[PDB]
Amino acid sequence: SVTVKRIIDNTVIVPKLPANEDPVEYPADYFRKSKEIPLYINTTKSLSDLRGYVYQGLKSGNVSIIHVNSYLYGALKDIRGKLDKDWSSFGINIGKAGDTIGIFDLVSLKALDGVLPDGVSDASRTSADDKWLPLYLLGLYRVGRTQMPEYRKKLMDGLTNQCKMINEQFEPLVPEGRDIFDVWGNDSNYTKIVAAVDMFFHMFKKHECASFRYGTIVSRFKDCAALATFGHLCKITGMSTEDVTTWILNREVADEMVQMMLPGQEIDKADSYMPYLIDFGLSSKSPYSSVKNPAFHFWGQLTALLLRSTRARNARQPDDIEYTSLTTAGLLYAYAVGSSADLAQQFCVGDNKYTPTNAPPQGRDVVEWLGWFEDQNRKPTPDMMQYAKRAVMSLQGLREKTIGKYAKSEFDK
Amino acid sequence: SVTVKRIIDNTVIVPKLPANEDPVEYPADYFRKSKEIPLYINTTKSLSDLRGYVYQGLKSGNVSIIHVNSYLYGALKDIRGKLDKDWSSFGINIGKAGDTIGIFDLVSLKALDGVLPDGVSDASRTSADDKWLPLYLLGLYRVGRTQMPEYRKKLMDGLTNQCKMINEQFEPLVPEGRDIFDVWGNDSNYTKIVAAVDMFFHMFKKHECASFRYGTIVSRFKDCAALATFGHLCKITGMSTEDVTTWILNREVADEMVQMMLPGQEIDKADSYMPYLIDFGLSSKSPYSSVKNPAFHFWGQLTALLLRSTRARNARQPDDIEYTSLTTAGLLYAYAVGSSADLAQQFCVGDNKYTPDTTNAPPQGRDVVEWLGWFEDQNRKPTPDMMQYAKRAVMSLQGLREKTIGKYAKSEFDK
Amino acid sequence: QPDDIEYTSLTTAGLLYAYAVGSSADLAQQFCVGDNKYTPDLTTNAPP
């Protein structure tokens, strides 16, 4: 309808509305540009000194990020780990047959000049060093993300991990909520380390120091929720990835989906850079984010909730999506799966069972159901509605703006 | 459906999703590699000394794990126990033919150099030693696992055991919750001892010192819940292991099942290493874990709950499994067993009852094929009676923790 | 809620729009494996 007229007086009106942008950036379409991920670990002073500046700065309540980065690079240059097979991603050849490589085999540059305290702090601290201090530093990245009292839930375990080797304790005193170290995650060089460590131990899963993954793990697939919800949807319906796809029933979810499955981005790859696209700063607007995949995110999570997901009662409810239709589509999917059990004899002793109008389709086929739905005047039947109710009533403790609370308001009146 | 097209514009889309790994590691496929389980009991200083470092470190509130390990090895080298028959597992020939063997006949190496306090602590403590001190040390392993106030439930008994010989008391002061000794379980060498002790006294069940099993027992079958739930399922339905198997009714439970019954792993063996696969570090991802057998675990426990298990009302409800179908399948199994009593005259006095004598009346016995068929007939949708059966099984359950399959079951069936 | 507007009629109009959208789901098969559903299949007071 490129053209709209106003009947009263036959004049043309041209409906337009404000431009929105934030186009996503994929990982591949970046190793076009550069062919290395720069890590500006700056000053290169003694490790013995650095061990000091931190152990102090920590117990103090302030310590330069610049210093901790440097210290980490210091204690982590263990060139440990022998390449099982080969290893390469996005064209970059990280290692090869038999090779021996270490964490920072992901691209070091140095820079700047200014620092803090002079040359050499309090010698008091020894090689109660690599062992555990880095783990702490990395640990805090995780803790620095959660905005809620749950943080002290993590820090608890964050140190009851800790206690292995020397049995220390707290370091700051100030809660968090953003101010303390909670802002380390804002340092493009810090994150790049967290990512390189996680990516590294994800490969050498088995390694004395692979414990460092604690707290370094929440960087893998950071800002890639949609991919995860899609995964859960398959696991939770029992359907194949291609079958689940066909159950997508509204354009902007298909749009979203097409956007996520763009090829040559290595998402199905074992150990690639793709999962850390954010923390290595490969991309500044993730294509796989839940906010750039709102329709999908809603549909997927709502459906999973009707199918009994616990994960899903707390998902966030996106804004500016087409709720009514998105949820009708979800209901149907959920109803189909919900009433047709896979159910098929699996083992035997010489005697198998050969399985040989408004009653709804037998299996889980989109076409059978779409058609049955037409037959129903494309309006949810009372049974579906009943199904929904028995899935949402008896849910308690629901945070607002969750699609749990949305679902319960919609179905359990 | 290797191929998916988008109708509006006939372009191909290739649905893919993130790779997951954690492949399991079986015990056997390990005694391929090594042929011994290394136990790095390090420093080898006087026992008299060690008895000290701990009795102190304990009353103190800190003591090196390294020390306690060493102490244990010290007081436990009782080479007690005479082999009843023969004994071997996974190729390793542990003993033979009337041999005499002791706990640490499972592979000692020494290592490192650094320690703590000098040469010789407080002589104050004597051979109120072997008797009871080791038991305490081992006892703590158990206590160190439970994350809940139940811990002081165990420690209570953990010492009201204790009281035998000497009548002592508490040692730390600080509760638990991970920090105190609750982290000993993280010491690959500590666990190896716990396992070796348990596996040893499980063989010499009858032995003055076999009391040490207290608290060393929760290492046996550690991280093998699925195997246990399968055992309970049989016991709780009355069915044989092979008949229970046939009642599996969804792929990913069969998958799971097949994974657990992989052959030559010695799971049905009397005294093998298999039960301790985790604490001897034979495997770092158990094939029998409840988390690597989620579908089975759910199905098995839900079914048992419908059949009146108490154990099962508190099992954990796994994530990322196919609930609806998993529970339809469970219901059916539970309904079949639930309505068809074994019921058969067993003793007599010359006069037996020979059992000899519709449509929607459901099958007579407990046969998968009869029922599957009957279920087809029912439009593969649970009938009102089944539904009623479920309700009367879950209503009147009270005190349900969230994320348990007890609470799941009650929400699904007792509206 | 603005003042000095024609509420009753403004909301009748809103209801209708909401009802239309609210009952007619977009709903259309989007992906497939060689078998699409061609939509090709109350006459009076059944709404559009």
Curated annotation (Swiss-Prot), chain C:
Subcellular location: Virion; Host cytoplasm
First and last residue of the signal peptide: none
Highest taxon of source: Viruses
Function: Encapsidates the genome in a ratio of one N per nine ribonucleotides, protecting it from nucleases. The encapsidated genomic RNA is termed the NC and serves as template for transcription and replication. The nucleocapsid is bullet-shaped with the tip containing 8 turns of a conical spiral before reaching the helical cylindrical trunk. Nucleocapsid assembly is concomitant with replication, therefore viral replication depends on the intracellular concentration of free N, termed N(0). All replicative products are resistant to nucleases.
Family assignment from sequence similarity: Belongs to the vesiculovirus nucleocapsid protein family.
Quaternary structure, from the entry: Homomultimerizes to form the nucleocapsid. Binds to viral genomic RNA; this interaction contributes to the virion assembly. N in the nucleocapsid interacts (via C-terminus) with the P protein (via C-terminus); this interaction allows to package the L polymerase in the virion and positions the polymerase on the template, since P acts as a bridge between N and L. N(0) interacts with the P protein; this interaction prevents the uncontrolled aggregation of N(0). Interacts with the matrix protein (inner layer); this interaction contributes to the virion assembly. Interacts with the L polymerase.
Protein name stated in the entry: Nucleoprotein
Organism: Vesicular stomatitis Indiana virus (strain San Juan)
The gene coding this protein: N
